[PDB]
């Protein structure tokens, strides 16, 4: 039953309150997401504090380091959360927990560049290209978004082959599984999002 219509509009509806930041705190929580995905431990000690803070209501205590960074651009004076900004980044934080190490890590490196938007438009062509969802089949990825050389190596490579995706070098490049679809949609919303905070 899922769809594509129903994974963008929760994308979409999540990513409201991010893309009406304002550019300062927009870029300081990118930076330090980035630095983020990189350490685990910060990750999970930033979504406990968000997830409490989010839950109970109550002030929430400090931060260190890039995660402290971030909690602070989501906070009022006071120490509670402002919900509407600390909720689509718990969102985003539960999405970024389904991707592999390696693929955290690449995104990490895609942040700094323009490749993230190329990778957003790249997964977004698989998951409605490969509608209907619950069908295996192949799918072909536009030549001009692979970069110069499309094989093992290749972020965008990795990226699908960490979604359970079976890739080749020749088009069809893309084994659409089932079994793919949760990784899958959930490197979409860490795109989309990470993207959203970018603009």
């Known amino acids: 039953a899922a769809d594509f219509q129903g994974l963008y509009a ?11 930041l304002e550019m300062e705190l927009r870029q300081q929580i990118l930076v330090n997401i980035g630095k983020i995905l990189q350490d685990q431990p910060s990750m999970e000690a930033l979504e406990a504090s968000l997830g409490q803070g989010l839950c109970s209501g109550g002030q929430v205590e400090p931060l260190d380091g890039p995660a402290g960074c971030i909690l602070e651009c989501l906070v009022l004076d006071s120490g509670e959360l402002v919900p509407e900004l600390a909720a689509p980044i718990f969102y985003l934080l539960g999405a970024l927990a389904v991707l592999s190490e390696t693929q955290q890590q690449l995104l990490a490196k895609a942040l700094e560049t323009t490749v993230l938007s190329k990778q957003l438009e790249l997964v977004k062509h698989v998951l409605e290209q490969s509608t209907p969802w619950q069908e295996q089949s192949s799918v072909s990825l536009p030549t001009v978004l692979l970069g110069d050389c499309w094989d093992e190596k290749n972020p965008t490579w990795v990226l699908l082959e960490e979604c359970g995706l079976r890739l080749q070098v020749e088009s ?7 079994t793919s679809l949760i990784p899958t949609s959930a490197l979409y919303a860490s795109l989309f999002l990470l993207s959203s905070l970018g603009q």
Request: contains cysteine.
């Open 10 to 20: 929760e994308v979409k509806a999540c990513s409201s309150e991010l893309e009406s």
């Open 172 to 178: 069809p490049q893309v084994h659409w599984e089932p």
